Amino acid sequence: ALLRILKETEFKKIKVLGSGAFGTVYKGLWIPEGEKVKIPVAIKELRPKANKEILDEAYVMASVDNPHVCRLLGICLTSTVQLIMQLMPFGCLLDYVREHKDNIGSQYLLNWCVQIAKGMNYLEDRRLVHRDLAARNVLVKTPQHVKITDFGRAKLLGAEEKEYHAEGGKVPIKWMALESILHRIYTHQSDVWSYGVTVWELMTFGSKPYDGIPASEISSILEKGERLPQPPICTIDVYMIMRKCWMIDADSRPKFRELIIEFSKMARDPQRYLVIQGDE
Numbered sequence: 001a002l003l004r005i006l007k008e009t010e011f012k013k014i015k016v017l018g019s020g021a022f023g024t025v026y027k028g029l030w031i032p033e034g035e036k037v038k039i040p041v042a043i044k045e046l047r048p049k050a051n052k053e054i055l056d057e058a059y060v061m062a063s064v065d066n067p068h069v070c071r072l073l074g075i076c077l078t079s080t081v082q083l084i085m086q087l088m089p090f091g092c093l094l095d096y097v098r099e100h101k102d103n104i105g106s107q108y109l110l111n112w113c114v115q116i117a118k119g120m121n122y123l124e125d126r127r128l129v130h131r132d133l134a135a136r137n138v139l140v141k142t143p144q145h146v147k148i149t150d151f152g153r154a155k156l157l158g159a160e161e162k163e164y165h166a167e168g169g170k171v172p173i174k175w176m177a178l179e180s181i182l183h184r185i186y187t188h189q190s191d192v193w194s195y196g197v198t199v200w201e202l203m204t205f206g207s208k209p210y211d212g213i214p215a216s217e218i219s220s221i222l223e224k225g226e227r228l229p230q231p232p233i234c235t236i237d238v239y240m241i242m243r244k245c246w247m248i249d250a251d252s253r254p255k256f257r258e259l260i261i262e263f264s265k266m267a268r269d270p271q272r273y274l275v276i277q278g279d280e
């Protein structure tokens, strides 16, 4: 995978898919000059660094090549930075599980857990700390295949860096590890905490974590030992994996490689681990 530099004339926006503080994502079409091939894409237009700095950030971004992480296909630099990325036709997984909650079985849920762990393990191998894992940031290529994406919070660790020490950026408190909330420290193991919350979101068909509770009260609740409750469909074996992801000692949490193994085992006999009516 390599980075392509695109001219504005190579692609067109068709419609808005979503927006946020990061900018706007459009559904789009890309036709590389003279290639005659039409490629459906998602165009992320970001809301200034030197062009060379931006391209260097994009070159590393384009080198991220894994079945469960969204890839950057090209970039266009004008008055704005536009990132041309793989299009995920079905949108964010959070909305997907909310919409299809009546028709989702144990096989799909556990397969998604495996895939997300595989994507995160790949990011860890690349020394990337994600810092924003949540069901809203997992996207659906097909019902059977999901991919993680990033909207600016991910950081690359240097060879000697074991953690990222954050500054003043706004934080998704309810998905964060306690050490991140208290000390602005982020590691692959704090990503594991966020993975646990993401799995809880999936198993509750997209329910809100610490629902109705002010973000400012979360660290105090976690310090008292309280955690998100066992989802109705979860056997205790699955809930205990979640609970391991939220242990106070980051080093005692499972690593993504371990999570791949454990959820893969469960995915082999899905109805043994998640209890869903009509499944099947």
Ligand SMILES: *CCC(=O)N[C@@H]1CN(c2nc(Nc3cnn(C)c3)c3ncn(C(C)C)c3n2)C[C@H]1F
Pocket (backbone or CB within 6 Å): 017, 018, 019, 020, 024, 025, 042, 043, 044, 070, 085, 086, 087, 088, 089, 090, 091, 092, 093, 094, 095, 135, 136, 137, 139, 149
């Ligand atoms: C629940 C989170 C959410 O809605 N986030 C929006 C959507 N988004 C996004 N969306 C798609 N595809 C899509 C298809 N149908 N819908 C409703 C959305 C994406 N494909 C690829 N990407 C990124 C890699 C750029 C997509 N991002 C992000 C946010 F705007």
